[PDB]
Amino acid sequence: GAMGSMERASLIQKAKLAEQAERYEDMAAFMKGAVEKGEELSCEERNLLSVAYKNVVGGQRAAWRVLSSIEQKSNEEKGPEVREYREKVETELQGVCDTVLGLLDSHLIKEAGDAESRVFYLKMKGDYYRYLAEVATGDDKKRIIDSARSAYQEAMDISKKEMPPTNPIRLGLALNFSVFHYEIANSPEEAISLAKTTFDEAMADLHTLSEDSYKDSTLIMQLLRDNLTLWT
Amino acid sequence: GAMGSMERASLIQKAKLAEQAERYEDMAAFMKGAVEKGEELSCEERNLLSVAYKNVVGGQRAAWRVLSSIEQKSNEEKGPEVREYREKVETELQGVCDTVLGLLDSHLIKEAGDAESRVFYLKMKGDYYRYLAEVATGDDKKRIIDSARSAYQEAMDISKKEMPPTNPIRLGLALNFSVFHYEIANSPEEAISLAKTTFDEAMADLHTLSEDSYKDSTLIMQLLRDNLTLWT
Amino acid sequence: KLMFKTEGPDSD
Amino acid sequence: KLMFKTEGPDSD
Numbered sequence: 001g002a003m004g005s006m007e008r009a010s011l012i013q014k015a016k017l018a019e020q021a022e023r024y025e026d027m028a029a030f031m032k033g034a035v036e037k038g039e040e041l042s043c044e045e046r047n048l049l050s051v052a053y054k055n056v057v058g059g060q061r062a063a064w065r066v067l068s069s070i071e072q073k074s075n076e077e078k079g080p081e082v083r084e085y086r087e088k089v090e091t092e093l094q095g096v097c098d099t100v101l102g103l104l105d106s107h108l109i110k111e112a113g114d115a116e117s118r119v120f121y122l123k124m125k126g127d128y129y130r131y132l133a134e135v136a137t138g139d140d141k142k143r144i145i146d147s148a149r150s151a152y153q154e155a156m157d158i159s160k161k162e163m164p165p166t167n168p169i170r171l172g173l174a175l176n177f178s179v180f181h182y183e184i185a186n187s188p189e190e191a192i193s194l195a196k197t198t199f200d201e202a203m204a205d206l207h208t209l210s211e212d213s214y215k216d217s218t219l220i221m222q223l224l225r226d227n228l229t230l231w232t
Numbered sequence: 233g234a235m236g237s238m239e240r241a242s243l244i245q246k247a248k249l250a251e252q253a254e255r256y257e258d259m260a261a262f263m264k265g266a267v268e269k270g271e272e273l274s275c276e277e278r279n280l281l282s283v284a285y286k287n288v289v290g291g292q293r294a295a296w297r298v299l300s301s302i303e304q305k306s307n308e309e310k311g312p313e314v315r316e317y318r319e320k321v322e323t324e325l326q327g328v329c330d331t332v333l334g335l336l337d338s339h340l341i342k343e344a345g346d347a348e349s350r351v352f353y354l355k356m357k358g359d360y361y362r363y364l365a366e367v368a369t370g371d372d373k374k375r376i377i378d379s380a381r382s383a384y385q386e387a388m389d390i391s392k393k394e395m396p397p398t399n400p401i402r403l404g405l406a407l408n409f410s411v412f413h414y415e416i417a418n419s420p421e422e423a424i425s426l427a428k429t430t431f432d433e434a435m436a437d438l439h440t441l442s443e444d445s446y447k448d449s450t451l452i453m454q455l456l457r458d459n460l461t462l463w464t
Numbered sequence: 465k466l467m468f469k470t471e472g473p474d475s476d
Numbered sequence: 477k478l479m480f481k482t483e484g485p486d487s488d
């Protein structure tokens with residue numbers, strides 16, 4: 001690993017600097033190096049890992065959708081270029097998803113014993129399978145979808161047993177699993193039911209929160225409301 | 233070259249697709265490959281080359297300024313990390329400038345005989361020396377500044393002899409040379425004089441233009457006005 | 465394509 | 477730092 005010679009603390013400091021500089025490819029490479037030190041991640045470090053790769057894969061998903069849309073127009077050939085370049089972006093996206101799933105499998109999920117860490121990592125495993133599902137078309141698409149569902153389901157089971165209904169990790173999980181249902185699993189009723197039950201159970205727990213916890217919870221509850229407004 | 237096996241026409245098509253996908257690193261790599269085919273560039277192709285690298289170096293300049301500002305705060309040590317990471321971004325910026333100057337020197341400028349092409353390339357040579365000057369501090373800073381001034385000056389001499397005062401390439405040159413004067417050469421009076429004379433000579437030529445040429449000219453004249461409003 | 469709200473940076 | 481207007485994409 002290219003980050004093998006850098007101190008763990010220096011990798012984390014540099015991930016924070018890369019985030020301020022909007023250098024998300026650098027931020028992800030620093031956090032990959034921090035993970036490969038083999039120590040469990042703190043809550044802040046798990047968030048740095050997630051923010052870095054979400055930004056990198058975000059740019060790739062946006063580029064992929066632009067190229068896929070042009071390819072579809074262009075097949076409704078004018079040569080192989082649009083397909084070749086969509087494939088190049090798709091392969092790069094798949095490699096970033098593969099890298100993140102590799103970090104989770106070696107060995108973040110297996111050492112994560114607290115509900116906060118284990119749910120966080122299982123949610124990420126769900127998300128990166130879901131990003132793979134968005135571009136999957138072959139004999140693999142069913143198996144990728146099932147891998148997303150399995151990770152999200154284990155995260156949901158733990159979150160319901162171990163976390164209050166307003167826990168922002170639990171809320172962000174349920175948000176993401178509901179979007180999975182709506183547009184990957186073709187299960188809009190499941191998506192709506194999950195988003196509604198999640199919203200309503202959080203609403204009833206808000207009275208237990210400080211002003212700071214209340215802001216963190218209601219920010220994610222607003223995303224559930226925004227989706228329900230589009231879906232119903 | 234990694235693009236050596238791809239058709240020139242396919243590289244240009246893919247540069248256009250990368251631009252739609254906001255994949256500017258890809259766009260620059262495709263246009264570098266197109267340049268290394270050894271054929272002169274059309275006006276559209278010169279603009280694709282310029283847009284690609286301007287976007288790439290733009291992100292690097294923005295990151296560099298963030299890190300330089302933190303480094304300066306941090307010296308008004310807390311370890312070598314801020315300096316190391318600023319140096320990493322600086323070295324990457326310098327390599328992109330080096331790559332562009334290498335394309336101009338091998339062999340875009342020497343085969344460019346028309347005023348439109350030759351001024352375009354000499355302006356770019358000025359710009360990439362200016363980006364190098366923004367981060368230069370050593371025994372090289374004077375020589376880099378002089379290289380920027382020399383390229384901008386040859387471009388200005390040709391543009392005044394060969395192009396009307398409203399020519400958008402001539403206008404964008406004078407804009408950039410005036411900013412060079414203001415904040416690289418420490419010559420604010422030269423910057424203001426250049427921006428004013430350029431604005432006033434363009435104003436007096438607008439009557440000769442079609443509605444489309446008038447929009448192209450007045451868009452750059454607005455940038456000269458915006459700078460003069462900050463400077464006077 | 466209409467991307468629904470999901471957790472964290474809206475980076476796409 | 478206050479970047480003045482220059483030609484083309486304002487990408488910084």
Ligand SMILES: N=C(N)c1cc2c(Cl)cccc2s1
Nearest residue numbers: 016019043044045047048051
């Ligand atoms: N963007 C970041 N650097 C961070 C995000 C978070 C979150 Cl969301 C929770 C706890 C800690 C952190 S640190």
Ligand SMILES: N=C(N)c1cc2c(Cl)cccc2s1
Nearest residue numbers: 016019020044047051216472
């Ligand atoms: N962008 C940052 N520097 C930070 C973001 C957050 C969040 Cl989102 C929660 C708690 C802590 C932090 S620190």
Ligand SMILES: N=C(N)c1cc2c(Cl)cccc2s1
Nearest residue numbers: 094095097098099101102132
């Ligand atoms: N890039 C991909 N298509 C995939 C990556 C992974 C990983 Cl890393 C584990 C299990 C399954 C998968 S599928």
Ligand SMILES: N=C(N)c1cc2c(Cl)cccc2s1
Nearest residue numbers: 196199200224225228229232
């Ligand atoms: N629990 C319900 N009956 C519903 C809740 C919502 C919300 Cl919160 C937004 C839009 C639509 C709906 S329908």
Ligand SMILES: N=C(N)c1cc2c(Cl)cccc2s1
Nearest residue numbers: 248251275276277279280283
């Ligand atoms: N962004 C682009 N693809 C292009 C920009 C220009 C300009 Cl500015 C002039 C003539 C042609 C072109 S093509």
Ligand SMILES: N=C(N)c1cc2c(Cl)cccc2s1
Nearest residue numbers: 248251252276279283448484
């Ligand atoms: N972004 C694009 N696709 C284009 C931009 C321009 C400009 Cl700026 C001038 C003449 C032509 C073009 S085509």
Ligand SMILES: N=C(N)c1cc2c(Cl)cccc2s1
Nearest residue numbers: 326327329330331333334364
């Ligand atoms: N990266 C750099 N510092 C420089 C690049 C170039 C080039 Cl390519 C030619 C003449 C001078 C210079 S200085």
Ligand SMILES: N=C(N)c1cc2c(Cl)cccc2s1
Nearest residue numbers: 428431432456457460461464
């Ligand atoms: N030629 C002049 N006297 C000046 C022209 C301008 C403009 Cl155009 C903007 C702001 C300030 C000034 S002073």
Ligand SMILES: [Ca+2]
Nearest residue numbers: 061062065134
């Ligand atoms: Ca997508």
Ligand SMILES: [Ca+2]
Nearest residue numbers: 293294297366
């Ligand atoms: Ca700069």
Ligand SMILES: [Cl-]
Nearest residue numbers: 084085088246
């Ligand atoms: Cl390609």
Ligand SMILES: [Cl-]
Nearest residue numbers: 014316317320
């Ligand atoms: Cl570094």
Ligand SMILES: [Mg+2]
Nearest residue numbers: 001002003033
């Ligand atoms: Mg490494």
Ligand SMILES: [Mg+2]
Nearest residue numbers: 006007008009
């Ligand atoms: Mg150590």
Ligand SMILES: [Mg+2]
Nearest residue numbers: 086087090091
């Ligand atoms: Mg593929």
Ligand SMILES: [Mg+2]
Nearest residue numbers: 188189190192
């Ligand atoms: Mg129904």
